[PDB]
Amino acid sequence: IGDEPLENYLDTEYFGTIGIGTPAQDFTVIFDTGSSNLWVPSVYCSSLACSDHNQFNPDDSSTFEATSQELSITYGTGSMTGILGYDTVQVGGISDTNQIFGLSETEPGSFLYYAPFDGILGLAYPSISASGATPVFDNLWDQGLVSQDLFSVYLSSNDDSGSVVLLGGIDSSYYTGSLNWVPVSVEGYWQITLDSITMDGETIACSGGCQAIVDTGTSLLTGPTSAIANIQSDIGASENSDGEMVISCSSIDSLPDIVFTINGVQYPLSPSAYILQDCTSGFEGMDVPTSSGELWILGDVFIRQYYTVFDRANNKVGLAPVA
Ligand SMILES: CC(C)CN(C[C@@H](O)[C@H](Cc1ccccc1)NC(=O)O[C@H]1CCOC1)S(=O)(=O)c1ccc(N)cc1
């Protein structure tokens, strides 16, 4: 069983350290349940974002094996191109030998330049991995490096220490109640069916069901712009001159929970969770069209409230309230 600590960066990004190569070269990577590729910047990249992050040097690793396979990924924000290679990845105390990963050759755009993390370690299904690159957790399981084909994620609140990805294990010290299991609706992302979103017993969005993904790599709770617009109005958030969805901090103590019904079970978010305070809305409009319909994204705003188990043995997501 492997424990990967995550840094909680301003309740917005959760990344941990990995080592690649022999001897290990260290990188910070987002542990991203909304994608499936592992990649880090490399010495082959001249993009600005590569220049201000750690760059992998295959020349200094005695276990690196080159390939001729190219890689390209487009994220919601950010993108990269590169080349695939094999090396040993140290993650969560596990020696992930023979791991294919992307060595970046381009990383355009400001987002990756200003981001504190070097790269991305995707934790979703192989079917959405660019160039069919074996995801890290698939390689761990293939090699028998975890005994149970699952991992769990605890994301801390209030910029606290303690966030972890637990590879091959479930730890009930991080939750209370009993885990409820949600079947994966479409294997790709960790995609599930949402039944409804309610507030004070009234349906405010997702009437008749909607598709959502559970995504550690997304900070906010996002949905189709139309539905989110109604939600913002429902809670009293309005856009600023600066484009910020401003909300009165007084409403944290007066507003009711917003309740997500998933596989028939109610998962409330208190206003303390869906209002960010330092006050702005934890909801964001973002349109994600797919074969299954527009995807909602249950990002860190949601996951901070529910210890989440990602079970590849039976293709289910488990949820329970955080301790
Ligand atoms: C660390 C990155 C990866 C963060 N992204 C989250 C990832 O989980 C992201 C979620 C997503 C899925 C499908 C459509 C759109 C977005 N996956 C993603 O695009 O996967 C790629 C490869 C497979 O299919 C598409 S983000 O959305 O770019 C993002 C960027 C900046 C902010 N402030 C918030 C979110």
Curated annotation (Swiss-Prot):
Active-site positions on this chain: D32, D215
Q: Which domain of life is it from?
A: Eukaryota
What modifications does the entry list under PTM / processing?
Minor amounts of the active enzyme occur with 'Ala-58' at the amino end.
**Alphabetic keyword roster:** Aspartyl protease, Digestion, Disulfide bond, Hydrolase, Phosphoprotein, Protease, Secreted, Signal, Zymogen
EC main class here is hydrolase
Give the record's GO CC terms.
extracellular region
Effect on the protein of changing D32A: Loss of activity
**Which of the residues bear the PTM Phosphoserine?**
S68
> Locate the Peptidase A1 domain: which residues?
14-320
Disulphide bridges in this chain? C45-C50, C206-C210, C249-C279
Q: Where in the cell is it found?
A: Secreted
EC number(s) on file: 3.4.23.1
Please provide the Gene Ontology terms (biological process) for this protein: digestion; proteolysis
GO MF annotations in UniProt = aspartic-type endopeptidase activity
Reactions this protein catalyses? Preferential cleavage: hydrophobic, preferably aromatic, residues in P1 and P1' positions. Cleaves 1-Phe-|-Val-2, 4-Gln-|-His-5, 13-Glu-|-Ala-14, 14-Ala-|-Leu-15, 15-Leu-|-Tyr-16, 16-Tyr-|-Leu-17, 23-Gly-|-Phe-24, 24-Phe-|-Phe-25 and 25-Phe-|-Tyr-26 bonds in the B chain of insulin
Keyword Signal in record:
yes
- Main function: Shows particularly broad specificity; although bonds involving phenylalanine and leucine are preferred, many others are also cleaved to some extent.
Tell me the protein family, please. Belongs to the peptidase A1 family.
Q: What is this protein called?
A: Pepsin A
Query: What species is given as this protein's source?
Result: Sus scrofa (Pig)
